[PDB]
Amino acid sequence: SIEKKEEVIAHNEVVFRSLTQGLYVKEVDIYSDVVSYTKDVDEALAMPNTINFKNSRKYKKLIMNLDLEPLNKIQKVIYETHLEGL
Amino acid sequence: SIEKKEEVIAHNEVVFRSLTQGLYVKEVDIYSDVVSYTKDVDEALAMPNTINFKNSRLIMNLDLEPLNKIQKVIYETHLEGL
Amino acid sequence: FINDRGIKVLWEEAYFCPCLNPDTGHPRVDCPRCHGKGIAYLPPKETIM
Amino acid sequence: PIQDAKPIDDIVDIMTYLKNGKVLRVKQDNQGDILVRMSPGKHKFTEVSRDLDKESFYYKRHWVLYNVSVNSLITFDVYLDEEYSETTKVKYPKDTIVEYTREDQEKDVAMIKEILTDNNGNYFYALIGETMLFDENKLNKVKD
Amino acid sequence: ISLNPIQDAKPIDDIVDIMTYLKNGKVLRVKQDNQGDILVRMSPGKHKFTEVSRDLDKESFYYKRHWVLYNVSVNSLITFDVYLDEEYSETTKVKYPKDTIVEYTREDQEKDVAMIKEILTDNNGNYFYALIGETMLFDENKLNKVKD
Amino acid sequence: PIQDAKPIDDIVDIMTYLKNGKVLRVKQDNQGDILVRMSPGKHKFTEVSRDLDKESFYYKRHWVLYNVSVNSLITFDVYLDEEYSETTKVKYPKDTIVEYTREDQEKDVAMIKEILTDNNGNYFYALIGETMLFDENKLNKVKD
């Protein structure tokens, strides 16, 4: 008995994964080649992906690397109001 | 898909509602008899939904339609692929 | 007269970029439309001035 | 053969596809590539985009009005945006000035007529006025 | 004792037919809102390009039109009505063109609005108007136009 | 019939009513409605009001001088302010361009000649040059 429902987006950012190694990028060099890795989603080279930050330039070389798999990490909070009768 | 999820109950209360007009109670008098009504579902007068309070004072009017209101707030994340 | 004494010039109109911060009211440091300046521009129009 | 290019010949077909609303890719000379589009809704007018990459959750194209000239369309090469191939990895592009030697050991200039390859990746080239195929080494890229 | 009906210069709406005619090389006439009426043409020969002329009359032995290269815009064609130069002419600048809703006084002293379906002319060059639902052809003075 | 309109024909009657001091309502084209009035006292001159609603304890009309033109009165429609009806709930207003089909299945245009209704609220419409009545569905509102 969902009386009302609402959704909120807290974060929306891109995170990259190596196809074979299964790790997530955390650091890059001056040439923008990967230097480090982590197996933790909470610590990754996050690229903002909100409305204002689309069409970036910082990570063009990183994107074109075929070994990397971009992922849209999105965090949400949803409020649900229940009326359960008496 | 879902990578991580957790559910918590922010509030759990009892809302009072009129049987004829259908409007919920907003403000009350000294004895807590109704003096104002409102169409809102959340702003309506409410009390904690636990047995101790119920035993500690339904009591105001014969319009006997209380409404157990429970609020579910959920935190979740997704990893949607390309 | 104007076409005679003028010089060929590109006229591009100005308009506030959507990238402006809704709360501070000041722009993003870098975006494709405007390079830090808070004002973007439309396609140019060839003109004599 | 290679499926990396499918240029449109008639401008009438271009206008027909624009009426259908499909995006186009329009090359330029010593300049960035362009995408062209017909605006939706009540008012119909051409729109252009300086961006080229495919739309995605992390990348969105920007469209603005422009008084596109039919001269550009009729003259410059045009492709369907969805079916365009970024690059064919060959030393020489199509329609490029090249130099070679004829069958009688006489040197001659020409432009590339066709770009071909075998199943093993070896690339063969055919020049204007020459039916036979030429090796990549046998050709020479003429300087402008 | 009259002259047969005269066709109105049909405006062309579809861009596709406009481009097809242009590719065929047939002349087009563009009614620009701001700066008058101009002719549009495709250059003959291999060096294809659009040309414009303001020599705004039918071609004649004593009056040959001069064509200047111009970068005609698609939007210009779309937003501006265009006509075939073989049709658009001074011959009949009728006050009430075909398909126009006009107000006409009926014999019962009741004003009615009808759409002109056919127009013709006579020896004097008058404009006989045919209205739907009636057989008798009205004259210029009797009719009236209602705008907006 | 419906009693929602009682337009005045002669300007002489309009001036006679103005001498009596009764307020008038004067329509406009794509513009707000106007009320007109004759000033009281020693000096006689026309006055106008942009307000329309009835006077009350919570609403009072505002009057100012204006050089009203007889052309407006003679041309535009005029009513008595007290007896005017705000709206008649019909799809098509009176004197509106409409399209229909004749008895021989021929399409024709016309303007509405009369607006009528039965006791059950069903609305019938009569067009110029057509004595018979037409259903609301049978009519078509022509676009300007």
Ligand SMILES: [Zn+2]
């Ligand atoms: Zn910006």
